[PDB]
């Protein structure tokens, strides 16, 4: 790999510089190199990895949605024929998005998840596995769509089981996992009632645990609780 000759600490240092410069493709490549050094990742390092790829795939997903919309319009009644270009370019962006998802999933499988033993790291990585299968599911249309969806579900479910046993209801990772699993139910699995029930129960159980928290932790938790509330207001 092109990062094989750079020190682990230098890769982390440059990942932080890339974030400051909003160079998220660079940031992702640096953190991929850090992961490939083979040592487990600290809490801060895990969040550098997630920030980098979240931003990269976020831009690809937004672009895919623009192109997919143009493509759907082109196939309505009365739309003039413009050739294969829209499909081709949507396919180009889709393939690059799938490549990024495959890269993240490959890092999780080789070998982040199997070495992660603490609840905070294991839940974090399983949530990530669910997230990137969900992004694959957003663009899937063929023979493997159902297996892609079930792979996202299974990863989210394993993470949920651990988080409920090992973390308090206000833990930001637990809350973000539940938020995203709820979105999976609503957007991918055609299960809006499950999405709503999960978001409500997660919100209510966190509300009842806020009294245990410091001011700084209270801020961290209520920020994510508001996102659950935003979705409930959108969905109901």
């Amino acid at each position: 790999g092109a990062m094989g000759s750079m020190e682990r600490a230098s890769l982390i240092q440059k990942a932080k510089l890339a974030e400051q410069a909003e160079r998220y493709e660079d940031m992702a490549a640096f953190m991929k190199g850090a992961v490939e050094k083979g040592e487990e990742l600290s809490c801060e390092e895990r969040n550098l990895l997630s920030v980098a790829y979240k931003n990269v795939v976020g831009g690809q997903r937004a672009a895919w949605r623009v192109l997919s919309s143009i493509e759907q319009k082109s196939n309505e009644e009365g739309s003039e024929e413009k050739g294969p270009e829209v499909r081709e370019y949507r396919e180009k962006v889709e393939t690059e998005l799938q490549g990024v998802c495959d890269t993240v999933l490959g890092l999780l499988d080789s070998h982040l998840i199997k070495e992660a033993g603490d609840a905070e790291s294991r839940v974090f990585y399983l949530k990530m596995k669910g997230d990137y299968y969900r992004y694959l599911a957003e663009v899937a249309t063929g023979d493997d769509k159902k297996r892609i969806i079930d792979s996202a579900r299974s990863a989210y479910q394993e993470a949920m089981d651990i988080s409920k046993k090992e973390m308090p209801p206000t833990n930001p990772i637990r809350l973000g996992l539940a938020l995203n699993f709820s979105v999976f139910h609503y957007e991918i699995a055609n299960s809006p009632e499950e999405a709503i029930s999960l978001a409500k129960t997660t919100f209510d159980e966190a509300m009842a645990d806020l009294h245990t928290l410091s001011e700084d932790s209270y801020k961290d938790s209520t920020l994510i609780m508001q996102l659950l509330r935003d979705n409930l207001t959108l969905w109901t």
Binding site: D131, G176, L179, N180, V183, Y186, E187, I224, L227, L228, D230, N231, L234
Partner: peptide, 6 residues
């Protein structure tokens, strides 16, 4: 709007 995720 869009669904919130984190």
């Amino acid at each position: 709007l869009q669904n919130k995720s984190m």
